[PDB]
Amino acid sequence: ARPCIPKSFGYSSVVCVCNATYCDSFDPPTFPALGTFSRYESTRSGRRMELSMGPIQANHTGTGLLLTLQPEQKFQKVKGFGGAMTDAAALNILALSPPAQNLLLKSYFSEEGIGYNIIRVPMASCDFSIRTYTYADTPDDFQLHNFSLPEEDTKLKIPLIHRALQLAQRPVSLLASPWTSPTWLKTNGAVNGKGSLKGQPGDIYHQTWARYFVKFLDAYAEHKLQFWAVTAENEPSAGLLSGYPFQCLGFTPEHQRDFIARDLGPTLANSTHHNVRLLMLDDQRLLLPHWAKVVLTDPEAAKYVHGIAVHWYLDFLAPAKATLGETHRLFPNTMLFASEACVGSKFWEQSVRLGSWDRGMQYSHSIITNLLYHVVGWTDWNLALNPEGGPNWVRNFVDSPIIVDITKDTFYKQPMFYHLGHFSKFIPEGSQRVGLVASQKNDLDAVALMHPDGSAVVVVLNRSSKDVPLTIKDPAVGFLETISPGYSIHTYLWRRQ
Numbered sequence: 001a002r003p004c005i006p007k008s009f010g011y012s013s014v015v016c017v018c019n020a021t022y023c024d025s026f027d028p029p030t031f032p033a034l035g036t037f038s039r040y041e042s043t044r045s046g047r048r049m050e051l052s053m054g055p056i057q058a059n060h061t062g063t064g065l066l067l068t069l070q071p072e073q074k075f076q077k078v079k080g081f082g083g084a085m086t087d088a089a090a091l092n093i094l095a096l097s098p099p100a101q102n103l104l105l106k107s108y109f110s111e112e113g114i115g116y117n118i119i120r121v122p123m124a125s126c127d128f129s130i131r132t133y134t135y136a137d138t139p140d141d142f143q144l145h146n147f148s149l150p151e152e153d154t155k156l157k158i159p160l161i162h163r164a165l166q167l168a169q170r171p172v173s174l175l176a177s178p179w180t181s182p183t184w185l186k187t188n189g190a191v192n193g194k195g196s197l198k199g200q201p202g203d204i205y206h207q208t209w210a211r212y213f214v215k216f217l218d219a220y221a222e223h224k225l226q227f228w229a230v231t232a233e234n235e236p237s238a239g240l241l242s243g244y245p246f247q248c249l250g251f252t253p254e255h256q257r258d259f260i261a262r263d264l265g266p267t268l269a270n271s272t273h274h275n276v277r278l279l280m281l282d283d284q285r286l287l288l289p290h291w292a293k294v295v296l297t298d299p300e301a302a303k304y305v306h307g308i309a310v311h312w313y314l315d316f317l318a319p320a321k322a323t324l325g326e327t328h329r330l331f332p333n334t335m336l337f338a339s340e341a342c343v344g345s346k347f348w349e350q351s352v353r354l355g356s357w358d359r360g361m362q363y364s365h366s367i368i369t370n371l372l373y374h375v376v377g378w379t380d381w382n383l384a385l386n387p388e389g390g391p392n393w394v395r396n397f398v399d400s401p402i403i404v405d406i407t408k409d410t411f412y413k414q415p416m417f418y419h420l421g422h423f424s425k426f427i428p429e430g431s432q433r434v435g436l437v438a439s440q441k442n443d444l445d446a447v448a449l450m451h452p453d454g455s456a457v458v459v460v461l462n463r464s465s466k467d468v469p470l471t472i473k474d475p476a477v478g479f480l481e482t483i484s485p486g487y488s489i490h491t492y493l494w495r496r497q
């Protein structure tokens with residue numbers, strides 16, 4: 001286990017400094033015997049996923065906070081965690097020397113790092129691109145004879161995805177999302193702004209756009225990559241907004257419903273890519289449950305839709321119970337998945353705050369809330385950005401868990417990286433959320449899950465300044481006596497037999 005090299009940039013915590021010859025890492029799991037628990041601890045004060053071990057006791061007495069596992073109370077199975085291979089993320093990763101590149105990719109994808117198993121791939125350009133392009137910019141090419149991947153895919157994104165896959169010991173699921181269609185399929189003839197597909201679902205424009213999904217999946221397959229899922233459109237509501245500056249393609253929920261039932265669903269189902277999952281919405285969770293009711297109460301759209309993808313940007317408006325909770329109650333067999341998050345887009349937010357503990361706590365708080373309301377996965381946005389929070393052709397810069405400094409062949413792992421790793425490292429695909437109750441009112445955020453191998457994992461986040469002593473009870477093993485320091489996050493692991 002190679003320790004964090006801390007550096008302060010004047011914010012609430014430190015970054016971990018990595019370069020060509022040094023990056024912090026973990027040792028392989030030792031799997032401690034029954035009656036012993038593992039603790040991974042990160043703190044604002046500087047601890048970075050530090051391992052300790054403790055005993056499990058047969059008995060407990062006291063008035064302190066007790067959290068009780070309810071292993072019989074079974075909820076959602078986890079798909080996984082990861083981030084987005086944008087043009088910007090690829091340009092930043094490839095600006096490092098090869099050994100620094102490999103330590104960045106190992107930080108995310110290896111067992112010596114945090115075990116990411118999801119990669120979101122934009123279908124052509126987004127704002128985190130240095131130029132605007134689609135795969136079919138030759139005008140009025142309804143045949144899509146001139147559909148091709150440019151070097152952003154063939155030289156940047158695809159080779160980095162292959163390298164990530166090879167470093168990962170877990171199977172990695174790829175998720176594709178489009179921002180815009182070719183401009184000649186759009187009402188406004190532009191990559192951005194208020195504009196939809198021309199015409200109506202079931203017509204030549206919509207059939208062409210559905211076939212474009214199949215051509216993308218064919219082109220990626222020529223490069224030996226297969227997708228787990230695609231979304232119906234990135235943030236479809238954004239294309240309904242006058243002057244929207246980012247690549248977009250506007251759909252009402254009715255438009256998405258009919259596009260899926262008539263065009264996208266049947267087109268994917270009648271392709272070699274029929275096993276690729278389709279996710280609807282890919283948008284702010286305040287749009288639930290309405291968007292789910294509009295799409296999923298139509299059997300001709302419902303039969304194609306595997307899940308509902310959500311973005312976190314307006315979560316302050318949208319209580320989880322009224323959105324995720326209500327959507328799970330009405331549509332319990334349609335999985336919910338968090339497909340995009342980042343801090344810093346808002347005009348008042350500094351784009352990049354190197355070492356921000358607040359930004360880390362935003363991530364872990366969101367992941368815990370999502371898991372407590374039936375969500376099966378959580379996806380970061382750009383895997384890496386430069387210290388300006390780009391590149392970005394619209395100059396809408398944001399933060400990333402890893403910041404690359406090309407001038408020093410150095411990258412910085414922020415608190416967001418460690419807060420995400422407290423889940424991604426320890427909650428593999430197939431883990432199941434289980435019950436966890438508190439003995440009294442408390443300021444902690446906590447979630448319990450069972451690993452496929454039956455072992456327990458509990459994440460405890462303390463967003464308060466105050467140390468909170470607490471006990472965890474598992475009826476199969478006994479009591480963990482621990483303490484949740486102010487501004488900390490813990491992951492607890494233990495065998496149950």
Ligand SMILES: *[C@@H]1O[C@H](CO)[C@@H](O[C@@H]2O[C@H](CO)[C@@H](O[C@@H]3O[C@H](CO[C@H]4O[C@H](CO)[C@@H](O)[C@H](O)[C@@H]4O)[C@@H](O)[C@H](O)[C@@H]3O)[C@H](O)[C@H]2NC(C)=O)[C@H](O)[C@H]1NC(C)=O
Nearest residue numbers: 002003004005006017018019020021022023024408409410
């Ligand atoms: C990539 O990042 C690495 C981590 O920051 C950089 O390594 C640091 O490199 C400096 C410059 O050589 C080292 O400092 C020197 O340290 C030695 C003492 O060495 C011994 O003790 C230190 C702890 O004090 C220990 O880290 C070493 O293993 C040795 O046991 C002094 O003699 C010098 O006066 C000077 O202070 C750092 O120790 C070193 N840290 C680590 C953790 O390796 C590396 O240089 C970066 N590479 C590039 C090219 O940017």
Ligand SMILES: *[C@@H]1O[C@H](CO)[C@@H](O)[C@H](O)[C@H]1NC(C)=O
Nearest residue numbers: 057058059060061062478479
């Ligand atoms: C521990 O738990 C058991 C429950 O079977 C209880 O009967 C026993 O007296 C407890 N031990 C102590 C020291 O309280």
Ligand SMILES: *[C@@H]1O[C@H](CO)[C@@H](O)[C@H](O)[C@H]1NC(C)=O
Nearest residue numbers: 137138139141144145146147
């Ligand atoms: C588009 O495709 C056809 C046939 O493969 C080719 O002859 C034509 O010149 C291409 N157009 C452009 C603009 O590259």
